[PDB]
Amino acid sequence: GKGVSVQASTLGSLEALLDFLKDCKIPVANVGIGPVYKRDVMQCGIMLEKAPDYAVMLCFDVKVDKEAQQYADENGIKIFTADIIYHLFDQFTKHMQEQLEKKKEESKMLAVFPCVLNPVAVFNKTNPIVVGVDVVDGQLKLNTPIAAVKMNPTTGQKEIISLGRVTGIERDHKPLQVCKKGQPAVAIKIEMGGHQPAYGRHLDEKDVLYSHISRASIDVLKQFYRDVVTTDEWQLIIKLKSVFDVQ
Numbered sequence: 513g514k515g516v517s518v519q520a521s522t523l524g525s526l527e528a529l530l531d532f533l534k535d536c537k538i539p540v541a542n543v544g545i546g547p548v549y550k551r552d553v554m555q556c557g558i559m560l561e562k563a564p565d566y567a568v569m570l571c572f573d574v575k576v577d578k579e580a581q582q583y584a585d586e587n588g589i590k591i592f593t594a595d596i597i598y599h600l601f602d603q604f605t606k607h608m609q610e611q612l613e614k615k616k617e618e619s620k621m622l623a624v625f626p627c628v629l630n631p632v633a634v635f636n637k638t639n640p641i642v643v644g645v646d647v648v649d650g651q652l653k654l655n656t657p658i659a660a661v662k663m664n665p666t667t668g669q670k671e672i673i674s675l676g677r678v679t680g681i682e683r684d685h686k687p688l689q690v691c692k693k694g695q696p697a698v699a700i701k702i703e704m705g706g707h708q709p710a711y712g713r714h715l716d717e718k719d720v721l722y723s724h725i726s727r728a729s730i731d732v733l734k735q736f737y738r739d740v741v742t743t744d745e746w747q748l749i750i751k752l753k754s755v756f757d758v759q
């Protein structure tokens with residue numbers, strides 16, 4: 513199985529620490545007694561391949577050899593030192609949290625929160641598009657990809673127009689992080705690298721704007737954001753895979 517590597521000064525303290533971790537549901541891959549050496553750090557490095565999070569050492573009341581510490585530093589293996597057990601636990605939990613956040617940041621572009629915008633006014637047509645809108649459903653967040661869905665009458669074929677991402681939100685000049693549904697109208701700034709759609713040409717003020725969800729976006733949302741996402745937001749998402757023709 514997979515798990516962290518622990519080390520204690522004595523056998524008894526080791527047993528106690530292991531019992532503690534048992535109650536904490538923290539899995540242990542291997543153990544050791546006495547000073548930490550390069551070999552033990554390597555033994556954690558074995559765990560590095562299977563689980564990056566679990567390639568860490570919980571060391572209780574134990575000297576760490578400079579060689580071992582240096583190898584750990586060279587190969588990204590965390591070594592945790594503590595005089596008391598609970599401190600070690602705390603350090604580990606914080607570590608796992610940090611790992612979670614770092615995993616979020618790579619999927620930051622991917623995670624998109626569902627929202628439907630009805631344009632109230634237009635301040636800048638393009639480069640960058642700025643639009644006074646009110647969130648009629650869902651929740652508008654920063655860095656949210658926006659798209660307008662519309663079918664040309666002659667073609668009768670659905671067109672998806674990606675406007676770009678939201679870089680700023682402001683209401684009465686006051687900067688906002690997000691805008692919930694039903695909230696009073698706000699002005700949002702959407703911009704993208706390269707050529708960008710233009711109001712009064714590609715799209716009109718009447719056209720309703722939707723968050724640009726993608727199968728990948730869904731997958732990311734259900735991978736890291738399950739706790740956060742409202743039921744209504746899931747509902748909206750399922751409504752949105754239809755308009756975006758998602759599998």
Ligand SMILES: [Cl-]
Nearest residue numbers: 657724725726
């Ligand atoms: Cl996309």
